Amino acid sequence: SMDPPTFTFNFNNEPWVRGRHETYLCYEVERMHNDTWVKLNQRRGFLANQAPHKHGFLEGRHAELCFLDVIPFWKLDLDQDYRVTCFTSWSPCFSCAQEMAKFISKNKHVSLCIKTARIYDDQGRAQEGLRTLAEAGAKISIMTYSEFKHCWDTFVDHQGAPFQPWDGLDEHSQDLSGRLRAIL
Numbered sequence: 280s281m282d283p284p285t286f287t288f289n290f291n292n293e294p295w296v297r298g299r300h301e302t303y304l305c306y307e308v309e310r311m312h313n314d315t316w317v318k319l320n321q322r323r324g325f326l327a328n329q330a331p332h333k334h335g336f337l338e339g340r341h342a343e344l345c346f347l348d349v350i351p352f353w354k355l356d357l358d359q360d361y362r363v364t365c366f367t368s369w370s371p372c373f374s375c376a377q378e379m380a381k382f383i384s385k386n387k388h389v390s391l392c393i394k395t396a397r398i399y400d401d402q403g404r405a406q407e408g409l410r411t412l413a414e415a416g417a418k419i420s421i422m423t424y425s426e427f428k429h430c431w432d433t434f435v436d437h438q439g440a441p442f443q444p445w446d447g448l449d450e451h452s453q454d455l456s457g458r459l460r461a462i463l
């Protein structure tokens with residue numbers, strides 16, 4: 280679980296704020312059991328991108344790559360159907376999106392849903408990767424109030440405090456979902 284200030288700073292969907300250099304990724308798994316999706320709450324977690332190593336030269340490992348690194352250790356049953364949801368503060372850069380597309384193509388027991396607080400630019404070339412991820416079968420969408428509240432409730436050390444939406448949450452979300460539709 281996550282510090283409240285850490286959630287609030289990072290999942291803020293106002294487009295004019297800066298300094299959100301990190302990407303946070305919260306994940307949940309459901310298994311299909313006879314027409315309903317059943318939550319596997321023992322599999323839930325979150326992670327962030329890694330800082331580059333002190334030696335320089337190589338970039339820090341991206342959260343999306345870390346996430347893919349971890350799935351094999353869940354030891355999912357290849358004969359079963361699973362729905363994996365990521366709640367991401369930024370959407371993936373191009374190279375991560377392509378890696379993700381490749382992953383889901385090779386693992387057809389996994390349905391991927393990425394719900395993103397904000398769209399990451401990746402100097403224009405990120406739009407292409409989001410189209411590639413959608414083509415390989417991933418559902419990509421913008422976090423609304425429902426997703427933000429769920430993530431607060433589920434992944435934050437809230438100590439019983441309810442999710443408090445920031446001013447503009449809904450409008451920013453709606454602006455972003457129009458952008459994403461254009462993109463896809």
Ligand SMILES: *c1cc(O)c(O)cc1N(C)N=O
Nearest residue numbers: 362363364390391392417418
């Ligand atoms: C993914 C994740 C999620 O929570 C819902 O409700 C639906 C999806 N979909 C539709 N994936 O294809």
Ligand SMILES: [Zn+2]
Nearest residue numbers: 332333334337
């Ligand atoms: Zn190193």
Ligand SMILES: [Zn+2]
Nearest residue numbers: 341371372375
């Ligand atoms: Zn990346």
